[PDB]
Amino acid sequence: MIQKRKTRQIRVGNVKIGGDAPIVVQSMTSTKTHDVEATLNQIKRLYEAGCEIVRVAVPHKEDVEALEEIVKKSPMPVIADIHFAPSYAFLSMEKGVHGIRINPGNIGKEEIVREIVEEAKRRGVAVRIGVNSGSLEKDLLEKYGYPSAEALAESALRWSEKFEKWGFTNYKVSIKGSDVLQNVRANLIFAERTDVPLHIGITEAGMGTKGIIKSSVGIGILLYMGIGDTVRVSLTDDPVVEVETAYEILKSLGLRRRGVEIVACPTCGRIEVDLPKVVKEVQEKLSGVKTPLKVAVMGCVVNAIGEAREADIGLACGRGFAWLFKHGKPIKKVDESEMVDELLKEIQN
Amino acid sequence: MIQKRKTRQIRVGNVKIGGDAPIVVQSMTSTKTHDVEATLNQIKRLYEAGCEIVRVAVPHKEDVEALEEIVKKSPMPVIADIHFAPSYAFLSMEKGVHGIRINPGNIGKEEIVREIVEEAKRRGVAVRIGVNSGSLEKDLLEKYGYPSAEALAESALRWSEKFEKWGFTNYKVSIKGSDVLQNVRANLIFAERTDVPLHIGITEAGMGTKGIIKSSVGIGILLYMGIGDTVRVSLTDDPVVEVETAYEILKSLGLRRRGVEIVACPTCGRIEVDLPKVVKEVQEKLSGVKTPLKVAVMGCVVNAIGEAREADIGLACGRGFAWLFKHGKPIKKVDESEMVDELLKEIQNME
Ligand code: SF4
Ligand code: SF4
Numbered sequence: 001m002i003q004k005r006k007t008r009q010i011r012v013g014n015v016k017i018g019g020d021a022p023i024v025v026q027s028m029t030s031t032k033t034h035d036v037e038a039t040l041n042q043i044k045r046l047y048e049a050g051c052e053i054v055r056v057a058v059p060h061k062e063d064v065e066a067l068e069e070i071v072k073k074s075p076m077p078v079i080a081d082i083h084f085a086p087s088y089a090f091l092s093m094e095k096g097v098h099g100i101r102i103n104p105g106n107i108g109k110e111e112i113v114r115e116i117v118e119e120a121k122r123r124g125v126a127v128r129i130g131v132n133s134g135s136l137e138k139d140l141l142e143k144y145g146y147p148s149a150e151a152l153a154e155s156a157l158r159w160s161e162k163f164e165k166w167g168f169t170n171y172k173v174s175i176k177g178s179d180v181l182q183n184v185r186a187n188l189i190f191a192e193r194t195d196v197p198l199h200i201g202i203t204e205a206g207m208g209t210k211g212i213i214k215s216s217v218g219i220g221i222l223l224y225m226g227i228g229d230t231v232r233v234s235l236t237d238d239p240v241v242e243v244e245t246a247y248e249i250l251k252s253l254g255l256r257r258r259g260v261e262i263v264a265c266p267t268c269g270r271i272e273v274d275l276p277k278v279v280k281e282v283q284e285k286l287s288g289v290k291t292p293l294k295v296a297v298m299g300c301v302v303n304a305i306g307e308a309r310e311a312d313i314g315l316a317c318g319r320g321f322a323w324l325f326k327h328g329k330p331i332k333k334v335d336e337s338e339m340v341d342e343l344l345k346e347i348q349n
Numbered sequence: 350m351i352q353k354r355k356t357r358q359i360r361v362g363n364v365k366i367g368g369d370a371p372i373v374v375q376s377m378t379s380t381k382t383h384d385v386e387a388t389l390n391q392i393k394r395l396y397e398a399g400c401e402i403v404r405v406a407v408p409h410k411e412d413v414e415a416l417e418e419i420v421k422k423s424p425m426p427v428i429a430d431i432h433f434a435p436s437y438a439f440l441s442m443e444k445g446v447h448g449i450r451i452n453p454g455n456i457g458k459e460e461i462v463r464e465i466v467e468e469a470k471r472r473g474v475a476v477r478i479g480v481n482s483g484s485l486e487k488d489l490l491e492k493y494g495y496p497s498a499e500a501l502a503e504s505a506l507r508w509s510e511k512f513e514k515w516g517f518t519n520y521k522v523s524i525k526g527s528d529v530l531q532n533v534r535a536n537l538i539f540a541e542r543t544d545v546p547l548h549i550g551i552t553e554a555g556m557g558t559k560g561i562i563k564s565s566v567g568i569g570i571l572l573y574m575g576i577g578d579t580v581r582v583s584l585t586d587d588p589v590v591e592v593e594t595a596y597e598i599l600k601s602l603g604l605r606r607r608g609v610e611i612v613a614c615p616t617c618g619r620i621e622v623d624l625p626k627v628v629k630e631v632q633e634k635l636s637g638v639k640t641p642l643k644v645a646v647m648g649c650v651v652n653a654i655g656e657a658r659e660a661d662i663g664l665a666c667g668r669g670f671a672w673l674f675k676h677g678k679p680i681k682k683v684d685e686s687e688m689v690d691e692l693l694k695e696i697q698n699m700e
C-alpha cells in the first residue's frame with residue numbers, strides 16, 4: 001500500500017540500508033562505553049530483541065580504548081557517536097568501527113569534515129550526517145532567521161551535495177526537527193530532492209507512555225509516506241523497549257516484524273467457515289515459530305487470495321478444505337488437515 | 350502546517366463537531382449499561398479526564414431502560430450503540446439520548462433505516478453511520494471481490510448520499526479497515542469526495558502498549574492529513590487511558606491538549622540566555638494553570654517571535670529582558686521579572 005521512496009543502497013558492515021533492503025531497526029547503548037562488559041551485555045540483549053545496528057557514545061579517551069573490543073565481540077555493526085573532536089572520529093575508525101555519526105555543522109572547519117569523509121572512504125566506514133537546530137550554520141540562520149524546517153533541510157542538502165562533490169557516496173542523513181510536524185516537513189523537503197537514505201526518529205520524545213505515543217505518531221507519518229531507511233525510537237528507557245517500540249510501529253504498517261504474525265480476515269458476507277476455530281488451531285500449531293512471516297487465515301477461498309497478496313503464506317479456507325497460498329499465488333488444495341502442511345511449508349521456507 | 354479538511358458542522362447535544370469546531374475526544378464506557386451506578390461513576394471519571402462525548406453499548410432490554418436515568422445527569426452528550434436489533438434505536442431515542450450509531454448495511458432493510466433517520470431529525474439526535482467489512486453489501490462485494498479500502502469507502506459514500514436524499518444532514522461516518530493502511534486509505538477516499546464529518550480510531554488495536562502504538566500510528570496519519578473531526582482510541586484497558594492517549598496524539602500534532610503546555614526552543618547558535626534556568630522558573634510559576642494554552646520559552650529575542658507564531662503566548666529572552674508575545678506579535682518588553690507579567694497576562698487571558 002505504501003509507495004516507498006527510491007533510495008541508493010549503502011552498507012554498514014553486513015547490513016544493507018536503502019533501496020531494496022528492509023527498513024533497519026537501530027538503537028543506542030545507554031551504558032558507559034568504557035565499561036566493555038556492561039555495554040556488550042546490553043548489545044547482546046539488543047541483538048536478542050532484533051536490533052540490527054547499534055550506536056555507541058564515545059565522549060572520552062577511555063571509550064576509544066574500549067571500542068576495539070566492542071567491535072570484535074559485537075554481533076552487530078557499531079556506530080561511533082562523535083561530537084567535538086575531529087580526532088575522535090579518526091581514532092574511532094582505526095578501532096574497527098563500522099560507522100561514524102557526526103554533526104558536520106559544528107565538528108570543525110568544512111575542510112576537516114572533508115578529511116573525515118576521505119578517511120571513511122579509505123576504510124569503508126559509513127557516515128551519518130546529523131543536522132539539527134544546534135548544528136545549523138551561521139549563514140543559513142541569517143537566511144531563515146530561525147531553525148525552520150526548510151533551514152534544516154537545506155543544511156542537509158548542502159552537506160549532501162558537498163559529500164557528492166568530494167566523491168563520497170556511502171552516507172545517510174538525519175534531520176531532527178523540534179516537534180513532529182517540523183521533523184516531518186524537514187525530512188520531506190530533503191526526501192523529495194535527493195536519493196540519500198534517511199535515518200528517522202523523534203529525539204526528545206518524552207517519558208514512558210507519552211514518549212512512545214509521540215514516537216509512534218512521528219515515525220509512523222514519515223513511514224506512511226515511504227520515508228525512512230533506518231529507524232530509532234529515542235526513549236529515556238531501556239534501549240530494548242526502544243527496539244520493541246520500533247518493531248510495533250513497523251508492524252502496524254506491515255514493513256517489519258519479529259517472529260510469526262498470524263492475521264485473520266476482516267471478515268465479510270462471503271465467509272465460508274468458522275474462522276475463529278481455524279485461527280485458534282493456527283495459533284496453537286504455529287506457536288514457537290521464529291521466522292518473520294505474516295501468516296494469513298482467510299474466511300473464504302477464491303477472493304481471499306487476491307485479498308492476501310502481501311502475506312507471505314496463508315490458508316484460504318473452504319467448507320471441508322483450504323487452499324495453501326504463497327506470496328499471492330495458490331499452491332495446492334488440502335483437506336481439514338491443512339495446518340500441518342502449512343507448518344511443513346514454513347519449515348521449508 | 351496542518352491542511353485541515355473542509356467539513357460541515359454537526360451537533361451532538363450541545364457539543365459541536367466538524368467544520369469550525371476543534372477535534373472532539375470521544376470514549377466508550379466499559380461497565381454494563383444496566384448497572385446505572387457503575388456507568389455514571391465511569392462517566393464522571395471520563396469527563397474529569399477530558400472526554401467530551403460518551404458512547405454507551407446497549408445489547409439487551411434492561412440497558413434501554415437504564416438510558417433514561419443516564420442522560421438526565423450526565424455532563425456529556427450520550428450516544429447509544431445499536432448492534433443487533435434496530436428496535437433498540439427507536440427505544441433509545443425516546444429515552445432522550447443525544448446520538449445513535451448504526452451499521453445500516455446489515456441493520457435490516459432500507460425501509461426501517463429510513464424511519465430511524467426520520468425520527469432522528471424530529472427529535473434532533475445525531476446518527477453515526479458505521480461501515481465495515483461485515484456491513485458491506487452483496488452489490489459492492491461483487492464489484493471489488495473483497496472488502497477493499499475503496500469497497501469500504503463507496504459503501505460509506507452511498508449511505509451518506511441516501512441520508513441526503515431523505516433530507517438528513519446531522520450525521521457523521523466511521524470506516525473500519527482491516528489494518529492501519531486500509532483504514533487510512535478508505536477514510537482518505539471518503540474525505541476527498543464529501544464534506545461529511547469523520548469519526549476516526551483503530552478498533553482492534555491490541556492490549557496495553559501495543560494498542561497504544563497502533564492507535565497512535567493509525568490516528569496520527571489521518572490527523573496529519575487533516576482528516577478526523579472526532580477521535581476515539583480503542584484499548585482493552587481502562588476508558589480513561591483511551592482519553593489520555595487521544596489527547597497525547599492530538600498534542601504531538603498541536604491540535605488539542607489538557608492543561609498548560611510549556612515548550613522551550615530547540616535551541617540554536619543565536620541563544621542569548623541560560624534557557625534551562627528560565628524554563629524551570631516558568632514551570633514553577635505556571636504550575637496551577639488549567640487553561641490549555643501553549644506557552645513558548647524561547648532562547649533569543651527577535652527571531653524567536655516568528656519561530657513561535659503558533660504558540661498562544663511566550664517569552665523571547667535576552668540578557669536583562671524578554672519580549673512578551675502572543676500569536677506571533679510582540680506586546681511589551683519586561684525586565685528579568687518577565688515571569689510574573691507572563692502569568693499576569695495568562696490570568697487576564699482567562700477573564
Ligand atoms: S477472505 Fe473472503 S470472507 Fe474474509 S474478508 Fe476477504 S472476501 Fe470476506
Ligand atoms: S528561539 Fe532563538 S535560540 Fe531558540 S531555536 Fe529559535 S532562533 Fe535559536
